[PDB]
Coordinates of C-alpha atoms in Angstrom, one line a residue:
Chain A
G1 CA -109.2 -106.9 36.7
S2 CA -110.4 -108.4 33.4
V3 CA -112.2 -105.2 32.4
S4 CA -114.1 -102.3 34.0
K5 CA -117.7 -101.9 32.8
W6 CA -117.3 -98.5 34.5
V7 CA -115.2 -96.0 32.6
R8 CA -114.0 -92.6 33.9
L9 CA -114.0 -89.9 31.4
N10 CA -112.5 -86.5 31.9
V11 CA -114.5 -83.7 30.2
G12 CA -112.7 -80.4 30.7
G13 CA -111.5 -81.4 34.2
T14 CA -114.8 -82.6 35.6
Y15 CA -114.7 -86.4 35.9
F16 CA -117.8 -88.0 34.6
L17 CA -118.0 -91.7 35.6
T18 CA -120.2 -93.8 33.4
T19 CA -120.7 -97.2 31.9
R20 CA -120.1 -98.4 28.4
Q21 CA -123.7 -99.1 27.5
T22 CA -124.5 -95.5 28.4
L23 CA -121.8 -94.5 25.9
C24 CA -122.9 -97.0 23.3
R25 CA -126.4 -95.7 22.7
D26 CA -125.6 -94.2 19.2
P27 CA -123.5 -96.1 16.6
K28 CA -122.0 -92.9 15.1
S29 CA -121.2 -91.0 18.3
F30 CA -117.8 -89.7 19.4
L31 CA -118.3 -91.3 22.8
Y32 CA -118.8 -94.7 21.1
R33 CA -115.3 -94.7 19.7
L34 CA -113.8 -94.3 23.2
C35 CA -115.4 -97.6 24.3
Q36 CA -113.3 -99.5 21.8
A37 CA -110.5 -101.5 23.4
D38 CA -108.4 -101.3 20.2
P39 CA -104.9 -99.9 20.5
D40 CA -105.8 -96.4 19.2
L41 CA -106.2 -94.5 22.4
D42 CA -103.7 -92.5 24.4
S43 CA -105.5 -89.9 26.6
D44 CA -105.7 -92.2 29.6
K45 CA -104.8 -90.3 32.8
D46 CA -102.7 -93.3 33.9
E47 CA -102.9 -92.3 37.6
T48 CA -106.4 -93.9 37.3
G49 CA -106.8 -94.6 33.6
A50 CA -109.4 -91.8 33.0
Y51 CA -109.6 -90.9 29.3
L52 CA -109.2 -87.2 28.7
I53 CA -111.7 -85.2 26.6
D54 CA -110.9 -81.5 26.3
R55 CA -114.3 -79.8 26.2
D56 CA -116.8 -78.0 28.4
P57 CA -118.1 -80.2 31.3
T58 CA -121.1 -78.0 32.0
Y59 CA -122.9 -79.0 28.8
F60 CA -121.8 -82.6 29.1
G61 CA -124.8 -83.1 31.4
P62 CA -127.6 -83.3 28.9
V63 CA -125.3 -85.3 26.5
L64 CA -124.7 -88.0 29.1
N65 CA -128.2 -87.9 30.5
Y66 CA -129.7 -88.3 27.0
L67 CA -127.2 -91.1 26.5
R68 CA -129.0 -92.9 29.3
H69 CA -132.7 -92.1 28.8
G70 CA -133.1 -90.4 25.4
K71 CA -134.7 -87.1 26.5
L72 CA -133.1 -83.7 26.5
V73 CA -132.9 -82.9 30.2
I74 CA -131.5 -79.4 30.9
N75 CA -130.5 -77.2 33.8
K76 CA -132.1 -73.9 32.9
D77 CA -128.9 -71.9 33.6
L78 CA -127.1 -73.7 30.7
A79 CA -127.2 -72.1 27.3
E80 CA -129.6 -73.4 24.6
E81 CA -127.0 -73.1 21.8
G82 CA -124.2 -74.3 24.0
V83 CA -125.8 -77.8 24.2
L84 CA -126.2 -77.7 20.4
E85 CA -122.5 -77.1 19.9
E86 CA -121.6 -79.4 22.7
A87 CA -123.4 -82.4 21.4
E88 CA -122.4 -81.5 17.8
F89 CA -118.8 -82.2 18.8
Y90 CA -119.8 -85.6 20.2
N91 CA -121.8 -86.6 17.2
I92 CA -125.1 -87.7 18.8
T93 CA -127.2 -87.1 15.7
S94 CA -130.6 -87.9 17.2
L95 CA -130.0 -85.5 20.1
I96 CA -128.7 -82.6 18.0
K97 CA -132.0 -82.9 16.1
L98 CA -133.9 -82.6 19.3
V99 CA -132.1 -79.5 20.5
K100 CA -132.4 -78.0 17.1
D101 CA -136.1 -78.4 17.7
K102 CA -135.7 -77.1 21.2
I103 CA -134.1 -74.0 19.9
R104 CA -136.7 -73.8 17.2
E105 CA -139.5 -73.9 19.8
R106 CA -137.6 -71.4 22.0
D107 CA -137.0 -68.8 19.3
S108 CA -140.2 -69.4 17.3
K109 CA -142.2 -68.5 20.4
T110 CA -139.6 -65.8 21.1
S111 CA -140.1 -64.7 17.4
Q112 CA -143.8 -64.0 17.7
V113 CA -145.7 -61.0 19.1
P114 CA -149.5 -60.7 18.9
Chain B
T1 CA -113.1 -37.3 39.6
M2 CA -110.0 -38.4 41.6
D3 CA -106.4 -39.6 41.3
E4 CA -104.3 -42.0 43.2
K5 CA -100.6 -42.5 44.1
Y6 CA -101.6 -46.2 43.6
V7 CA -100.8 -45.9 39.9
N8 CA -97.1 -45.4 40.7
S9 CA -97.0 -48.5 42.9
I10 CA -97.9 -50.8 40.1
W11 CA -95.9 -48.7 37.6
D12 CA -92.8 -49.3 39.8
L13 CA -93.4 -53.1 39.7
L14 CA -94.0 -52.9 36.0
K15 CA -90.9 -50.7 35.7
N16 CA -89.0 -53.0 38.1
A17 CA -89.9 -56.0 35.9
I18 CA -88.7 -54.4 32.6
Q19 CA -85.2 -53.7 34.1
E20 CA -84.9 -57.3 35.2
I21 CA -85.7 -58.7 31.8
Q22 CA -83.0 -56.4 30.5
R23 CA -80.8 -57.8 33.3
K24 CA -81.2 -61.3 31.8
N25 CA -82.5 -63.0 35.0
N26 CA -86.2 -63.7 34.5
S27 CA -86.4 -66.1 37.4
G28 CA -89.1 -64.8 39.7
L29 CA -90.8 -62.6 37.2
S30 CA -94.2 -63.8 36.0
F31 CA -96.0 -62.9 32.8
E32 CA -99.5 -63.4 34.3
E33 CA -98.8 -60.8 37.0
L34 CA -97.3 -58.3 34.6
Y35 CA -100.0 -58.4 31.9
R36 CA -102.7 -57.6 34.4
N37 CA -100.6 -54.8 35.9
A38 CA -100.2 -53.3 32.4
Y39 CA -103.9 -54.0 31.9
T40 CA -104.7 -52.0 35.0
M41 CA -102.6 -49.1 33.8
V42 CA -104.3 -48.8 30.4
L43 CA -107.7 -49.5 31.9
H44 CA -107.6 -46.6 34.4
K45 CA -107.1 -44.1 31.5
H46 CA -103.3 -44.0 31.9
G47 CA -102.3 -45.1 28.5
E48 CA -100.3 -42.0 27.7
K49 CA -98.6 -42.3 31.1
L50 CA -97.9 -46.0 30.4
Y51 CA -96.9 -45.2 26.8
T52 CA -94.4 -42.6 27.9
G53 CA -93.0 -44.7 30.8
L54 CA -92.3 -47.4 28.3
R55 CA -90.3 -45.1 26.0
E56 CA -88.1 -43.9 28.9
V57 CA -87.5 -47.2 30.6
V58 CA -86.2 -48.9 27.5
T59 CA -84.3 -45.7 26.4
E60 CA -82.3 -45.4 29.5
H61 CA -80.9 -48.9 29.3
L62 CA -79.8 -48.6 25.7
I63 CA -78.0 -45.3 26.3
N64 CA -76.7 -46.1 29.8
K65 CA -75.7 -49.8 29.1
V66 CA -76.1 -51.0 25.5
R67 CA -74.4 -48.0 23.9
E68 CA -71.6 -48.1 26.5
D69 CA -70.6 -51.7 25.5
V70 CA -70.8 -50.9 21.8
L71 CA -68.5 -47.9 22.4
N72 CA -66.3 -50.3 24.4
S73 CA -66.3 -52.8 21.6
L74 CA -65.3 -50.3 18.9
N75 CA -61.9 -52.0 18.5
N76 CA -62.5 -55.4 20.1
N77 CA -65.0 -57.8 18.4
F78 CA -67.2 -54.8 17.5
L79 CA -69.4 -56.6 15.0
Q80 CA -69.9 -59.4 17.5
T81 CA -70.9 -56.9 20.2
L82 CA -73.4 -54.9 18.1
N83 CA -75.0 -58.1 16.9
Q84 CA -75.1 -59.4 20.4
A85 CA -76.8 -56.2 21.6
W86 CA -79.5 -56.4 19.0
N87 CA -80.0 -60.1 19.6
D88 CA -80.6 -59.5 23.3
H89 CA -82.6 -56.3 22.6
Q90 CA -84.9 -58.4 20.4
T91 CA -85.4 -60.9 23.3
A92 CA -86.3 -58.1 25.7
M93 CA -88.6 -56.2 23.4
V94 CA -90.8 -59.3 22.5
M95 CA -91.4 -59.6 26.3
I96 CA -92.2 -55.9 26.4
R97 CA -94.6 -56.4 23.5
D98 CA -96.1 -59.4 25.3
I99 CA -96.5 -57.6 28.6
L100 CA -98.1 -54.5 26.9
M101 CA -100.3 -56.3 24.4
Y102 CA -103.5 -54.6 25.6
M103 CA -101.9 -51.2 25.4
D104 CA -100.6 -52.3 22.0
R105 CA -104.3 -52.6 21.0
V106 CA -106.4 -49.9 22.6
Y107 CA -104.1 -46.9 23.0
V108 CA -101.9 -47.4 20.0
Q109 CA -104.8 -47.8 17.5
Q110 CA -106.8 -45.0 19.1
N111 CA -104.0 -42.3 19.4
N112 CA -102.0 -43.2 16.2
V113 CA -98.6 -43.6 18.0
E114 CA -96.2 -46.3 16.9
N115 CA -96.8 -49.8 18.3
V116 CA -94.7 -51.3 21.1
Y117 CA -92.2 -53.2 18.9
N118 CA -91.9 -50.3 16.6
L119 CA -90.8 -48.2 19.6
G120 CA -88.5 -51.0 20.8
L121 CA -86.6 -51.1 17.5
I122 CA -86.9 -47.3 16.8
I123 CA -85.1 -46.4 20.0
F124 CA -82.5 -49.0 19.3
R125 CA -82.3 -47.3 15.9
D126 CA -82.1 -43.7 16.9
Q127 CA -80.1 -44.0 20.1
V128 CA -77.5 -46.7 19.5
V129 CA -77.4 -47.8 15.9
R130 CA -77.7 -44.5 14.1
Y131 CA -75.6 -42.7 16.7
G132 CA -72.8 -40.9 14.9
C133 CA -69.6 -42.6 16.2
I134 CA -71.2 -46.0 16.3
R135 CA -73.1 -45.5 13.0
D136 CA -70.0 -44.4 11.1
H137 CA -67.6 -46.8 12.8
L138 CA -70.2 -49.5 12.0
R139 CA -70.3 -48.5 8.4
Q140 CA -66.5 -48.2 8.1
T141 CA -65.9 -51.5 10.0
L142 CA -68.1 -53.5 7.6
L143 CA -66.6 -51.7 4.5
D144 CA -63.2 -52.6 5.9
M145 CA -64.1 -56.3 6.1
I146 CA -65.8 -56.5 2.7
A147 CA -62.9 -55.0 0.7
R148 CA -60.4 -57.3 2.5
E149 CA -62.8 -60.1 1.5
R150 CA -62.5 -58.8 -2.0
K151 CA -58.7 -59.0 -1.4
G152 CA -58.8 -62.8 -0.8
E153 CA -59.1 -62.6 3.0
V154 CA -61.1 -65.3 4.8
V155 CA -63.8 -63.3 6.6
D156 CA -66.8 -64.1 8.7
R157 CA -69.4 -63.4 6.0
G158 CA -72.1 -64.3 8.5
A159 CA -71.0 -61.6 10.9
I160 CA -71.4 -59.1 8.0
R161 CA -74.7 -60.7 6.9
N162 CA -76.2 -60.7 10.4
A163 CA -75.5 -56.9 10.7
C164 CA -77.0 -56.5 7.3
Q165 CA -80.2 -58.3 8.5
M166 CA -80.0 -56.3 11.7
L167 CA -80.1 -53.1 9.7
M168 CA -82.8 -54.4 7.4
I169 CA -85.3 -55.1 10.3
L170 CA -84.3 -51.8 11.9
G171 CA -85.9 -50.2 8.8
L172 CA -89.3 -51.4 9.8
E173 CA -91.4 -51.9 6.6
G174 CA -88.9 -50.1 4.3
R175 CA -85.4 -50.7 3.1
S176 CA -84.5 -47.0 3.7
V177 CA -82.6 -47.5 7.0
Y178 CA -80.6 -50.2 5.2
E179 CA -80.2 -47.9 2.2
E180 CA -79.2 -44.8 4.1
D181 CA -76.5 -46.4 6.2
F182 CA -75.0 -49.3 4.2
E183 CA -76.4 -49.9 0.7
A184 CA -75.9 -46.5 -0.9
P185 CA -72.4 -46.0 0.6
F186 CA -71.7 -49.6 -0.5
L187 CA -72.9 -49.2 -4.1
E188 CA -70.9 -46.1 -4.9
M189 CA -67.9 -47.5 -3.0
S190 CA -67.9 -50.6 -5.3
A191 CA -68.2 -48.3 -8.3
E192 CA -64.8 -46.9 -7.5
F193 CA -63.5 -50.4 -6.8
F194 CA -65.1 -51.6 -10.0
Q195 CA -63.8 -48.6 -11.9
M196 CA -60.3 -49.2 -10.7
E197 CA -60.4 -52.9 -11.5
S198 CA -61.9 -52.4 -14.9
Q199 CA -58.9 -50.4 -16.2
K200 CA -56.6 -52.7 -14.3
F201 CA -57.6 -55.8 -16.3
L202 CA -57.9 -53.9 -19.5
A203 CA -54.2 -53.3 -19.4
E204 CA -53.5 -57.0 -18.4
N205 CA -55.4 -59.0 -21.0
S206 CA -57.5 -58.8 -24.1
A207 CA -61.3 -58.7 -24.6
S208 CA -62.1 -62.4 -24.0
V209 CA -60.2 -62.6 -20.7
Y210 CA -61.6 -59.2 -19.7
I211 CA -65.1 -60.5 -20.4
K212 CA -64.4 -63.8 -18.6
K213 CA -63.4 -61.8 -15.5
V214 CA -66.4 -59.5 -15.8
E215 CA -68.9 -62.4 -16.0
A216 CA -67.2 -64.2 -13.1
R217 CA -67.1 -60.9 -11.1
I218 CA -70.8 -60.4 -11.9
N219 CA -71.5 -63.9 -10.6
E220 CA -69.0 -63.4 -7.7
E221 CA -70.6 -60.1 -6.5
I222 CA -74.1 -61.5 -6.8
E223 CA -73.1 -64.6 -4.8
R224 CA -71.8 -62.4 -2.0
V225 CA -75.1 -60.5 -2.1
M226 CA -76.8 -63.8 -1.6
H227 CA -74.5 -65.1 1.1
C228 CA -73.0 -62.0 2.7
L229 CA -75.4 -59.2 2.1
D230 CA -79.2 -58.9 1.9
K231 CA -80.7 -60.6 -1.2
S232 CA -82.5 -57.3 -2.0
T233 CA -79.2 -55.6 -2.9
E234 CA -78.6 -57.7 -6.0
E235 CA -80.2 -55.5 -8.7
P236 CA -78.6 -52.3 -7.3
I237 CA -75.1 -53.8 -7.5
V238 CA -75.7 -55.3 -10.9
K239 CA -76.7 -52.0 -12.4
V240 CA -73.5 -50.5 -10.9
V241 CA -71.5 -53.5 -12.0
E242 CA -72.8 -53.3 -15.5
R243 CA -72.3 -49.5 -15.7
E244 CA -68.7 -49.5 -14.5
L245 CA -67.1 -52.6 -16.0
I246 CA -69.2 -52.9 -19.2
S247 CA -71.1 -49.7 -20.0
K248 CA -68.0 -47.5 -19.4
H249 CA -65.8 -49.8 -21.5
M250 CA -68.1 -50.7 -24.4
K251 CA -66.2 -49.1 -27.3
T252 CA -62.9 -50.4 -26.0
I253 CA -64.2 -54.0 -25.8
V254 CA -65.3 -53.7 -29.5
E255 CA -61.7 -52.6 -30.4
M256 CA -59.1 -54.1 -28.1
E257 CA -55.5 -54.0 -29.1
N258 CA -55.2 -56.5 -32.0
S259 CA -58.5 -57.8 -30.7
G260 CA -62.1 -56.7 -30.0
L261 CA -65.4 -57.3 -31.8
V262 CA -63.7 -56.1 -35.0
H263 CA -61.0 -58.8 -34.7
Chain C
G1 CA -91.4 -85.0 25.1
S2 CA -91.1 -83.3 28.5
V3 CA -94.1 -81.2 27.4
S4 CA -97.9 -81.7 27.3
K5 CA -100.8 -80.6 25.1
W6 CA -103.3 -80.1 27.9
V7 CA -103.1 -77.1 30.3
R8 CA -104.9 -76.4 33.6
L9 CA -106.1 -72.8 33.8
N10 CA -106.6 -72.1 37.5
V11 CA -108.8 -69.1 36.6
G12 CA -110.4 -67.4 39.6
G13 CA -109.6 -70.5 41.7
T14 CA -111.6 -72.7 39.3
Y15 CA -109.8 -75.3 37.3
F16 CA -110.4 -75.1 33.6
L17 CA -108.8 -77.9 31.5
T18 CA -108.1 -77.3 27.8
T19 CA -105.6 -78.2 25.1
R20 CA -102.9 -76.0 23.7
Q21 CA -104.3 -75.8 20.2
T22 CA -107.6 -74.8 21.7
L23 CA -106.2 -71.4 23.0
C24 CA -104.4 -70.5 19.7
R25 CA -107.4 -69.2 17.8
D26 CA -106.1 -65.6 18.2
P27 CA -102.2 -65.6 18.6
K28 CA -102.4 -62.0 19.8
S29 CA -104.4 -63.4 22.8
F30 CA -103.3 -63.3 26.4
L31 CA -103.8 -67.1 26.6
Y32 CA -101.7 -67.9 23.5
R33 CA -98.8 -66.3 25.4
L34 CA -99.7 -68.6 28.3
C35 CA -99.9 -71.5 25.9
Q36 CA -96.1 -71.3 25.1
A37 CA -93.0 -72.4 27.0
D38 CA -91.5 -68.9 26.9
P39 CA -88.8 -67.6 29.4
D40 CA -91.4 -65.5 31.2
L41 CA -94.0 -68.0 32.3
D42 CA -92.4 -70.4 34.8
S43 CA -93.2 -68.2 37.8
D44 CA -97.0 -68.5 37.2
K45 CA -97.5 -72.1 38.1
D46 CA -99.2 -74.1 40.9
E47 CA -98.1 -77.1 42.9
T48 CA -100.1 -79.2 40.4
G49 CA -98.6 -77.4 37.4
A50 CA -101.8 -75.5 36.7
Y51 CA -101.2 -71.9 35.6
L52 CA -102.4 -69.5 38.2
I53 CA -104.6 -66.8 36.5
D54 CA -106.3 -64.1 38.5
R55 CA -109.5 -63.1 36.6
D56 CA -113.2 -64.1 36.9
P57 CA -113.7 -67.9 36.9
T58 CA -117.3 -67.8 35.7
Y59 CA -117.3 -65.3 32.8
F60 CA -114.3 -67.2 31.5
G61 CA -116.7 -69.9 30.1
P62 CA -117.8 -68.0 27.0
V63 CA -114.2 -67.0 26.3
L64 CA -112.8 -70.5 26.5
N65 CA -115.6 -72.2 24.6
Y66 CA -115.3 -69.6 21.8
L67 CA -111.7 -70.8 21.6
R68 CA -113.1 -74.3 21.3
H69 CA -116.0 -73.9 18.8
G70 CA -115.8 -70.3 17.7
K71 CA -119.3 -69.4 19.1
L72 CA -120.3 -67.4 22.1
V73 CA -121.9 -69.5 24.9
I74 CA -123.5 -67.0 27.3
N75 CA -125.3 -68.9 30.1
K76 CA -128.6 -67.1 29.9
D77 CA -128.4 -65.5 33.3
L78 CA -124.9 -64.0 32.8
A79 CA -124.8 -60.4 31.6
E80 CA -123.5 -59.6 28.1
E81 CA -121.8 -56.5 29.5
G82 CA -119.7 -58.7 31.9
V83 CA -118.0 -61.1 29.5
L84 CA -117.0 -58.1 27.2
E85 CA -114.6 -56.8 29.9
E86 CA -113.4 -60.4 30.5
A87 CA -112.9 -60.7 26.7
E88 CA -110.9 -57.4 26.6
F89 CA -108.4 -58.8 29.1
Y90 CA -107.7 -62.0 27.2
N91 CA -107.3 -60.1 23.9
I92 CA -109.6 -62.1 21.7
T93 CA -110.1 -59.2 19.3
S94 CA -112.7 -60.9 17.2
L95 CA -114.6 -62.1 20.2
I96 CA -114.5 -58.6 21.6
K97 CA -116.3 -57.5 18.4
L98 CA -119.2 -59.9 18.4
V99 CA -120.1 -59.4 22.1
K100 CA -120.1 -55.7 21.5
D101 CA -122.7 -56.2 18.8
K102 CA -124.6 -58.6 21.1
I103 CA -124.6 -55.7 23.6
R104 CA -125.8 -53.5 20.8
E105 CA -128.1 -56.3 19.7
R106 CA -129.7 -56.5 23.1
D107 CA -130.6 -52.8 23.0
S108 CA -132.4 -53.3 19.7
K109 CA -135.1 -55.1 21.8
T110 CA -134.4 -53.5 25.2
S111 CA -133.7 -49.9 24.1
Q112 CA -136.6 -50.1 21.6
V113 CA -139.5 -47.7 21.4
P114 CA -142.8 -49.7 21.1
Chain D
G1 CA -92.8 -68.3 50.3
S2 CA -92.7 -65.4 52.8
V3 CA -95.4 -63.7 50.7
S4 CA -97.7 -64.7 47.9
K5 CA -99.3 -62.2 45.5
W6 CA -102.4 -64.5 45.4
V7 CA -104.8 -64.1 48.3
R8 CA -107.3 -67.0 49.0
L9 CA -110.7 -65.7 50.2
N10 CA -113.3 -68.0 51.7
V11 CA -116.2 -65.7 51.3
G12 CA -119.0 -67.4 53.1
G13 CA -118.6 -70.8 51.6
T14 CA -117.5 -70.1 48.0
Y15 CA -113.7 -69.8 47.5
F16 CA -112.3 -66.8 45.6
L17 CA -108.7 -66.5 44.5
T18 CA -107.5 -63.1 43.5
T19 CA -104.3 -61.0 43.3
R20 CA -103.2 -58.7 46.2
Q21 CA -103.1 -55.8 43.7
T22 CA -106.8 -56.3 42.8
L23 CA -107.9 -56.1 46.4
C24 CA -105.6 -53.1 47.1
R25 CA -107.3 -50.8 44.4
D26 CA -108.3 -48.3 47.1
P27 CA -106.7 -48.8 50.5
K28 CA -109.8 -47.6 52.4
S29 CA -111.5 -50.9 51.3
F30 CA -111.9 -53.4 54.0
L31 CA -110.6 -55.9 51.6
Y32 CA -107.3 -54.0 51.4
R33 CA -107.0 -54.2 55.2
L34 CA -107.1 -58.0 54.9
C35 CA -104.2 -58.1 52.5
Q36 CA -101.7 -56.4 54.8
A37 CA -99.2 -58.7 56.5
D38 CA -99.6 -56.9 59.8
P39 CA -100.2 -59.2 62.8
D40 CA -103.8 -58.1 63.6
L41 CA -105.5 -60.6 61.3
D42 CA -105.3 -64.4 62.1
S43 CA -108.6 -65.8 60.7
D44 CA -107.9 -68.5 58.1
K45 CA -108.5 -72.2 57.5
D46 CA -105.4 -73.7 59.0
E47 CA -104.7 -76.3 56.3
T48 CA -105.1 -74.0 53.3
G49 CA -104.5 -70.4 54.6
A50 CA -107.6 -68.8 53.1
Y51 CA -109.1 -65.8 54.8
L52 CA -112.4 -66.6 56.4
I53 CA -114.8 -63.8 55.4
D54 CA -118.4 -64.5 56.5
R55 CA -120.5 -62.8 53.8
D56 CA -122.6 -63.9 50.8
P57 CA -120.3 -65.5 48.2
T58 CA -122.8 -64.9 45.4
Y59 CA -122.9 -61.1 45.8
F60 CA -119.1 -61.0 46.2
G61 CA -118.5 -61.4 42.5
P62 CA -119.6 -57.9 41.5
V63 CA -117.6 -56.5 44.4
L64 CA -114.4 -58.4 43.4
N65 CA -115.0 -57.7 39.7
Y66 CA -115.0 -54.0 40.3
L67 CA -111.7 -54.5 42.3
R68 CA -110.4 -56.5 39.3
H69 CA -111.5 -54.4 36.3
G70 CA -113.2 -51.3 37.7
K71 CA -116.8 -51.8 36.6
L72 CA -120.1 -53.1 38.0
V73 CA -120.9 -56.5 36.6
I74 CA -123.9 -58.2 38.1
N75 CA -125.5 -61.4 36.9
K76 CA -129.2 -60.9 36.1
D77 CA -130.2 -63.1 39.1
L78 CA -128.1 -61.3 41.7
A79 CA -130.1 -58.5 43.4
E80 CA -128.6 -55.1 42.9
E81 CA -129.6 -54.2 46.4
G82 CA -127.7 -57.3 47.5
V83 CA -124.4 -56.2 46.0
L84 CA -125.0 -52.7 47.3
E85 CA -125.2 -53.7 50.9
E86 CA -122.5 -56.3 50.2
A87 CA -120.4 -53.5 48.8
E88 CA -121.1 -51.4 51.8
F89 CA -119.4 -54.0 54.0
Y90 CA -116.1 -53.8 52.2
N91 CA -116.1 -50.0 52.2
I92 CA -115.2 -49.5 48.5
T93 CA -116.6 -46.0 48.6
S94 CA -116.6 -45.8 44.8
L95 CA -118.6 -49.0 44.2
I96 CA -121.4 -47.9 46.5
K97 CA -121.1 -44.5 44.8
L98 CA -122.0 -46.5 41.6
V99 CA -124.5 -49.0 42.7
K100 CA -127.1 -46.5 44.0
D101 CA -127.2 -44.9 40.6
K102 CA -127.9 -48.2 38.8
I103 CA -130.4 -48.9 41.6
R104 CA -132.0 -45.5 41.0
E105 CA -131.6 -46.0 37.2
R106 CA -133.3 -49.4 37.5
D107 CA -136.2 -48.0 39.5
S108 CA -136.6 -44.7 37.7
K109 CA -136.8 -46.5 34.3
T110 CA -139.3 -49.1 35.6
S111 CA -141.8 -46.8 37.4
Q112 CA -141.5 -44.1 34.7
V113 CA -144.9 -43.4 33.3
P114 CA -144.6 -42.2 29.6

């Protein structure tokens, strides 16, 4: 095959299949560097070629979802701060702003009592 | 409140493990299992029971096995054996420390008893190393080898050094255990050796050659301290070296026969 | 090099993937011992090579992520009192501390007197 | 191997992997009876050899956690009554001895008029 527009990440064990354009939404993001076909990459699980990314899969959801539709979608059971740290690692600036607002809204309301 | 014989069941497996490490066949034993076992012991308010059982289980092996070889090696590669024992004992005790880490945190810091590795070395210190016949035979054996080295004999300096390191670590955070058993006997022993040599060479040559030997001996002994003894022994020996060869013979050196500072 | 930098913790049946240097934040930690190639680990291994660990697979999340980004990630539903006794087992002494305060922190609002 | 210290529980749909010792904390426990190698029990998935226990996997966590670290850890969503009855099934007389108090403590605190 010439190339696979589909790429198979491994994020803390959980395989997250996705497409380059999903990963190329932000010029300065960690995930963007993975997309490069330059020789600087050695975490391919050669049994299938899945690149390995050692971090928590559970919070990888909102990161990947935002990386497709640009809104902070959440499963309530996930931690508010955990997504802040999780994206922080991946370097999606626009998102980590949004969550920092999400936390701000969460606590600010939580910080008030009539 | 209630109590269970179940505590012993895990204790036996934890005990059974410790022997096997000391038997030097780890195949089959698993750290994951043991740490949780130890965890369960300390968690059920049995730290004192676990703490005591540790002290015994190691102690028996040292006195029943380790000491026996050291006694058996008194006149056959002794230094090799005693080092070998403490090398292996180190290997075993790190595992013991690794299996008891939780107990090493909660019970030790709460009850002010000595930590696991302190106990591991201490029992090796009280029961085998500082044991009279081994202790003195150890001291004598090393002193036998060093003097012969001073007598031009090719000697395994590393063997002596290793034992010196062995004793140093056996002292925990202080030099004392090294000072009590080897250093202080060594320093005063060398004074008699230095004292005898000083008057020997005074009757063999004049001041300049006497000085030449003294400086070389000063360097020679220090070099041995670097390469055959602990490096912390240097200053002690130098004060002894200076006191015996130089300080005792000052007025002589000033006034040697047809020589001296006057001449 | 006949060795890898990524380990598979089979905690509580769950597979957690993480990299050696991730676990070494506290060398006095249970995991750090697991992280090595010592003469007392070979027994605890799976057919896959994953290390077989026998504690809770769900409260492990905050513990492992703390070893990743030095902050507690408590999924909101989980109980603060529950990770503490998972923390204790792993011997992350500093982590044990901050949860305890969190437990104490919770009572500031829950054990309050209006 | 003739024996394996790890027992594989299929507790009503969600797998649990735990050590024999953890289940055997008090032999009266129905869980302990499962661990024994006697010939009475034969219910397990043939391929994987996991005991088939037909009970709520969710509420089993607090039951197994007590049998792992001797305390009652219950996620905020799990009903205390649910673990209580769940605990009753396994016959860990100590756990049920605890749950009712928390139950009573929970209710007494709530309905308490100042």
